[PDB]
Structure 1
């Protein structure tokens, strides 16, 4: 029953939930949609990718396709 309060992971729950029920939000896609006056100028997104894989493992996130040329990971309903 430990409430964890992440930083960049909080940043991706708004970047995942900004689009709804159709599987269209990728690491490459999210990084260009989220890069607005806060984050590390360069290689901030490597931690974006670490945040997303750990978010998948909590159970909040799922995937249909991912990495390379195309992807999509979105919030599996609680």
Structure 2
């Protein structure tokens, strides 16, 4: 029950903190979030779920792959 902002804010924070062509993958973001925040045991599921919903909104844009297994970037 530790403090932590939403997953949308964390992922966006993790992607933008990482200067990179292919934005970021799911694995990259997960290890960033784990060390830069107090996150629970279900980080991975919530990260997985958040990318799923941000892609469909068009908040997150896709780079390589298709779906939660890939590399992605933020839209402008």
Pairing of 1:1-78 with structure 2 (within 5 A): 7-20=6-19, 22-36=21-35, 37-40=37-40, 42-66=41-65, 67=69, 71-77=70-76
What is the count of residue pairs matched by the alignment? 68
User: Which has the higher Rg, Structure 1 or Structure 2?
Assistant: 1
**Structure-2-length-normalised TM-score:** 0.73
Native 8 Å contact 2:23 2:63 kept in 1? no
Question: Once the 2 structures are TM-superposed, how far is the Cα of residue 72 of structure 1 from its aligned partner?
Answer: 0.9
Q: Which runs of 5+ in 1 are unaligned?
A: 1-5
Deviations 1:41-71 (A, max 9, x none): x23211111111111122121112232xxx3
Per the normalisation by structure 1, the TM-score is 0.72
Runs of 4 or more, structure 1, over 4 Å off, are none
Q: What do you get for the CA RMSD once the two structures are aligned?
A: 1.9
- Relative to total residues, which structure has the larger helix share, 1 or 2? 2
Gaps of 5+ in 2: none
